[PDB]
Enzyme design. Structure first.
Site, PDB file in Angstrom:
ATOM      1  N   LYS A 101      -2.985  -1.220  -8.067  1.00 48.06           N
ATOM      2  CA  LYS A 101      -3.603  -0.850  -6.744  1.00 48.06           C
ATOM      3  C   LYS A 101      -2.670   0.215  -6.188  1.00 48.06           C
ATOM      4  O   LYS A 101      -3.221   1.243  -5.551  1.00 48.06           O
ATOM      5  CB  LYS A 101      -3.783  -2.102  -5.828  1.00 48.06           C
ATOM      6  CG  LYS A 101      -4.117  -1.576  -4.528  1.00 48.06           C
ATOM      7  CD  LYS A 101      -5.602  -0.891  -4.221  1.00 48.06           C
ATOM      8  CE  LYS A 101      -6.138  -0.496  -3.127  1.00 48.06           C
ATOM      9  NZ  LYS A 101      -6.255  -1.642  -2.026  1.00 48.06           N
ATOM     10  N   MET A 142     -11.623  -5.293   5.975  1.00 46.59           N
ATOM     11  CA  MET A 142     -11.975  -5.740   4.814  1.00 46.59           C
ATOM     12  C   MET A 142     -12.249  -7.398   4.749  1.00 46.59           C
ATOM     13  O   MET A 142     -13.203  -7.653   4.062  1.00 46.59           O
ATOM     14  CB  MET A 142     -10.679  -5.341   3.754  1.00 46.59           C
ATOM     15  CG  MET A 142     -10.694  -3.805   3.804  1.00 46.59           C
ATOM     16  SD  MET A 142     -12.009  -2.937   2.812  1.00 46.59           S
ATOM     17  CE  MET A 142     -11.513  -3.408   1.154  1.00 46.59           C
TER      18      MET A 142
END
EC number: 1.1.1.373
Lengths: 295, 295, 294, 295
Positions: free
Chosen positions: D170, D11
């Site tokens: 999240k 990421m």
């Protein structure tokens, strides 16, 4: 005595065989003609259907795979009820749904017939030697009348305490042993993944509730005496489960019963039981089932 | 002997007290000054920190809530390592993560120090009377050296058979007993919902794997002998679990461990084990964990 | 058309009511005399039992609580089969066990009778307005023949593609929605325990598989295309579940479906799938179910 | 702007790459030299450690595997704090424990430093194209200040509504999606075992809560409006789950989430909710978590 025996499977065949040895006259029926022939060779009379088996029988024993087959043998076409005397006693030795047992006993009583539930513990090896555990449901009068017949097939008779109580105690026993096997496997496989010899784990567990069970160790002097003061707090038990599941998840040992058990202890902590004895889990499950709290 | 004791909680205080009674000289430390004062009143020497506790001690015992606190006491500011002789022996009696125990033992050995894991079974009542179960990890030489000290705090010692094996067997034992309690509660509440007196169920289960466990009953002559020929087929065990869950769901007795267990037996049937002995569930769980089939 | 309707419960009563509104001649039966009286007041003919309901009916509808009651109404004492023409069509609109549906259809065909499964989606409010979802099992010929009748009770018909496919798709739908509700509750309660306003969570989840589902998002281009190369590795998904369960256990939010789901991911990691896409969990479940690997 | 980027994983690398594309000057650090080399080739300046990365940076981004690594990069040897201006803004984009995020933000504020939590939704393919979902925790002032930077890495920003709310949403999102995948697989495999084409199931489920979710369909006008009057009774939902589990067990499709879900509905029935709307399962789970009943 004159006995009808319906169901000559892995359990039924040796049970019927022991009755022949004790001098009973058996009329036998099963859907498998070879199983009938095997009992005929030992001195049984064959019957074409349950009704013919039941004709002039004092005791009618059923040993069948499930409650639908018991109902069909008792109430179906050429069923036991077509051949049954009101003085006879039907003994279902099958392991079936207990609420189906209740309904069969009620339906038999509505037609003036007497039926009791005497499922058995232990396996076919014990069936051969007549050393089954007899879990005797029925009224005290029915258990007294049946006992001489039952002791041909089993070596130990437990008074289950009423109609439908035999199948209930069989179901509680088998529920506990069958589920316990899956939990036992999780503990043993985690043990192997941690490279601990299993014999060491068994030696330790044989001295604790792990190997002896809670019913006669941790429960009697705590939850079963209405005392939830902690010997071992729910908070600590919950922490230890989290450690076991952390290890299992790092070592890819799936532990579904352990994972489920931690969410039970989590619910107990949510209910304010974290500082209660671990035996308070019994009260938590009672409350979750809608029962009145005892403590 | 000269002993350091760090951790004077519900277990540590009576353990330290028993060492004093047997005539050892103890230097004690805990974050709770009143817990230290209580042991000092019984003839312990106080320490300002773990390093001072350890100075000139032959045996250093830790009894603490978790692995982070054990690491901080051994390796942190004014930690045991700053006061420790290479001839001394550290004994962690804490219940912590076993891979944390391994790393503490390794980190101690890297600094030339000797450390073993001796967690304990039984609760604080047993800690008071010196009747704890000693789960002795460590080398043969460490267990031999520690035994005279350990027998001041416990009445039975099990040699777990190596460094880190004590904390492993403690974790397996507690995993099994803690999860077993939740399953035991399900069986007991289903028993109540079916109007069956609990003592009748316990009388039956005391004679089967339900009450005695599978480890020494159903497993030894089947799965543990590499023999999965059936005494009790997985198909039948799976069917009986389905009946138990049917009844529990009709009577609103939530049985999460039972529900999870049936899906384990379902996976066993999917893997082709339906006609195998129920002890084959051990092999199913081994395979689920990525282990090589033994049978 | 001449219709028999057996089962006048919360769904059956308004369904039978809509057939009367669209001009059909109904013979009704239910064990509840008040439910029969309500339909008779709307123009239905009462029948004494299922056999009499079925006599001279072209279409026989059953709407009953379970498969044992459907079997008893079709095959029992004074059952539909005693009054049924071989030219008639039996439509079971009940939600029952699909293997019981198969056996009822087979048992009817053995006696020369035609039976199809058309269970319904949506609730009794939709039953009142004739806006049910019709989940039409049966042969193409049966669905074609039944459609004019069915469109009096529902606003949308899905052809499930065969005998027994209607009850199968109803069961898959309801299994998924009913279980999903319990999981949704766990996520919402953990959200509350973390002091996060629920509306914020729903806004985020509406943009991911959390709110949109995997069936049409994460699965089509991965597991359903035979591609298990990772967009989101099983190892990461498994780690995140562990964090969720750590938080839930610290905050005493019981999450049994989450706890069960992590042990499923753990089994996938044991089977060597840790570096596979999270959609590979479908292949893991297929293998666990004894199916041939894809 | 002058940005430090620590964490160049699957990421982090493409996120840092997009900041370079939007004309920011990046100092990057990772222990993985190949990841650093790739960013240096795109115009990043390498740093020897987090402290050097942070020197003269306005924004410090961390993207790391866990909260221990974030803490070590911020507070450890040569940590960000040694190079950080009090006027700078630290953005942790990691997925870590939310209580770890809270403690990092508090520990940074104690040293006069400003830190916010902005984890991301969607995967590395979206990281490459700058189409991540930005889950922006932090104060209104922090979100306003960070937004221009954040929009280089993501295409949509959601204001989570405060410090620590980004990591919370999240965690809720990923909990729900990851568990939903396992449930989705059970439904799809049961579908296949029943010989129903999956496309037919998806067509039906796309029109119901099965495919659309409960959050915006069944819940808003019932439980979320304090109305538990039934559209679909818990008793009926529980019955249908029992049918699904009966079929799954006959077809040996293991359904652990389904099995667990039925015992949740069973507990709801035990609590007297059987005639309540199925959305009342939310209230049942709230009560199980020790929360005060709303409805």
């Amino acid at each position: 005595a004159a006995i009808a025996f319906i169901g000559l499977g892995q359990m039924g065949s040796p049970m019927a065989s022991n009755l022949l040895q004790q001098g009973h006259q058996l009329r036998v029926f099963d859907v498998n003609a070879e199983a009938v022939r095997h009992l005929v060779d030992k001195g049984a009379t064959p019957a074409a259907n349950p009704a013919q088996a039941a004709k002039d029988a004092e005791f009618i024993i059923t040993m069948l795979p499930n409650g639908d087959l018991v109902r069909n043998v008792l109430f179906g076409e050429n069923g036991v009820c077509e051949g049954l005397s009101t003085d006879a006693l039907v003994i279902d030795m099958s392991t079936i749904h207990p609420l189906q047992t209740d309904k069969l006993i009620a339906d038999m009583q509505a037609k003036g017939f007497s039926m009791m539930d005497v499922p058995v513990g232990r396996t076919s090896a014990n069936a051969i030697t007549g050393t089954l555990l007899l879990l005797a449901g029925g009224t005290a009068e029915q258990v007294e009348r049946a006992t001489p017949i039952l002791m041909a097939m089993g070596s130990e008779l437990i008074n289950a305490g009423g109609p439908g109580m035999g199948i209930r105690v069989k179901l509680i026993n088998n529920y506990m042993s069958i589920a316990l096997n899956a939990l036992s496997a999780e503990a043993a496989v985690l043990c192997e993944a941690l490279n601990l010899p299993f014999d060491v784990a068994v030696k330790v567990m044989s001295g604790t509730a792990a190997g002896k069970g809670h019913f006669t160790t941790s429960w009697p002097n705590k939850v079963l005496s209405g005392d939830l003061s902690p010997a071992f707090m729910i908070d600590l038990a919950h922490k230890d489960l989290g450690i076991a599941l952390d290890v299992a998840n790092q070592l890819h040992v799936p532990m579904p019963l352990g994972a489920a058990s931690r969410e039970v202890y989590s619910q107990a902590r949510a209910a304010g039981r974290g500082r209660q004895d671990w035996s308070a889990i019994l009260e938590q499950v009672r409350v979750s089932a809608g029962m009145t709290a005892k403590v």
